[PDB]
Amino acid sequence: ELIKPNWDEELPKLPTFEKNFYVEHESVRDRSDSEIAQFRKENEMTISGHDIPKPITTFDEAGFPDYVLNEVKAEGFDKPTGIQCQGWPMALSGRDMVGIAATGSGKTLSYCLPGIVHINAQPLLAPGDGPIVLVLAPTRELAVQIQTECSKFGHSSRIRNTCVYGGVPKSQQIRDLSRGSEIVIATPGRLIDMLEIGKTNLKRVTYLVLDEADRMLDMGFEPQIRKIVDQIRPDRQTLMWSATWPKEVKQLAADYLNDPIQVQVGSLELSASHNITQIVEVVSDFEKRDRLNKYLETASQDNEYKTLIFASTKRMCDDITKYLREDGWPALAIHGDKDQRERDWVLQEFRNGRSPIMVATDVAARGIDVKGINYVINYDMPGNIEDYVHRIGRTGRAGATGTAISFFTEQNKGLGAKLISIMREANQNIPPELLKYDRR
């Protein structure tokens, strides 16, 4: 079962790997130190640690070999993600890292591409051997996300992966751990039920990634995790990602890392309460009024519904309500352009049922508590994401259920990426062709 070796007696008998692969093109050093400090805090990165690499700013600037540099731009993307631009240099250079970013961030390429480079510097699997890079994820869905990126970027080489997670045939995973995987992704539960049968082993693990560490401990995989990391040689490179910062994540990082850099990209992320169902639809500005009515009537048969509509201009809450009451919707517009005299009986006739549907702007969305709002509808997609979550937050907290409908178009491109990271935080269904903003 357990037994936890002494890493002074078995360690100097173990072979020894190299884990630095970064060239640090002189394009990046120097730029410097007013614009890499401007770049760093424009992605709201907050780094700390010793000897922290300057971020790259294009694919060529990351010291990637070509069999993966070619396939990383072949995705048709310019100027790789912020998390990729500070993460790839420290990962390729073999340091350990604790990264703070929201659940759903563009984190998995951060460490899978340097992992691929980490493998093809090392002897082959030499039958009897187990994985080189080991990734631990809480959920099956993230584990398969990760393996999609590991076979996409691994195909160029022999790199073979097999993720072992729970709720699937436990002998077609004995048959996949049988067959020399260089990458093994595992929920910690099933990794321990394959390590007592001894169908796999971690004594060639040199590169460890704990993804979504915080919600790995939430579901109490901490016992499991702690007794898989003991089994791994302590001169490994170790990368750990977390959205929150509990006392135990703080200690998990303390126990199982070694001189790590601390990168925080996110903003200590916010609830987007899970009582709300979220409906996004990729549409044009043109056909958008058409789909207003479809959902307006889907909500407008249940009494007493109360919908809240948002649009970008305040001029386009008049044209939206002049349209909406012209075929008999009890719709009133709220905004500061006119008459704040008669702006606050729209709400004395909103929390009763006199006019269930009220249309307003983000600037107009100012400190009013009319909660009871059902089926809130973003006609015009906002420019930041801290407003989207402030928009949709007014439904379903007492009556802890509600719906949110968003009309997403191409003039929200820069918000596509961040928006998906708010849905997988809340384990919500994602439109099949909103997903094309997933990373970068």
Residue numbers in the entry: 57 to 496
What does the paper say about this structure?
Human DDX5 and its yeast ortholog Dbp2 are ATP-dependent RNA helicases that play a key role in normal cell processes, cancer development, and viral infection. Similar to other DEAD-box proteins, DDX5/Dbp2 is composed of two RecA-like domains that include 11 conserved motifs. The helicase core of Dbp2 consists of two RecA-like domains (RecA1: aa 101–319; RecA2: aa 332–465), an NTE (aa 53–100), a CTE (aa 466–496), and a linker (aa 320–331). Here, we report the first X-ray crystal structures of the Dbp2 helicase core alone and in complex with ADP at 3.22 Å and 3.05 Å resolutions, respectively.
The Dbp2 catalytic core apo (Dbp2-apo) crystallized in space group C121 with 2.5 molecules in the asymmetric unit: two molecules (aa 57–496) in nearly identical conformation (rmsd 1.11 Å) and a half molecule (aa 57–326). This molecule fragment composed of NTE-RecA1 is likely generated by the limited proteolysis of the linker between the RecA1 and RecA2 domains. In the crystal structure of Dbp2-apo, two RecA-like domains adopted an open state, with the NTE subdomain located on the exterior surface of RecA1 and the CTE subdomain inserted between two RecA-like domains. To estimate the position and intrinsic mobility of the two RecA-like domains, we calculated the distance between the centers of mass of the RecA1 and RecA2. This distance was 42.9 Å in the open state, showing that the two domains were far apart, as shown in Figure 2B. In the Dbp2-apo structure, the RecA1 and RecA2 domains are restrained by the linker and CTE subdomains. The RecA1, RecA2, NTE, CTE subdomains, and linker form an interaction network, stabilizing the conformation. In the structure of Dbp2-apo, the CTE consists of an α-helix and a disordered loop that inserts into the cleft of the helicase core. Residues R495 and R496 of the CTE form five hydrogen bonds with V128, E131, and T137 of the Q motif in the RecA1 domain (black box). We solved the first crystal structure of Dbp2 to date, illustrating that the protein is rigid and in an open state. In contrast, the CTE has two conformations: one in which Dbp2-apo is wedged between the helicase core and one in which the addition of ADP induces it to move out of the way of the ATP binding site.
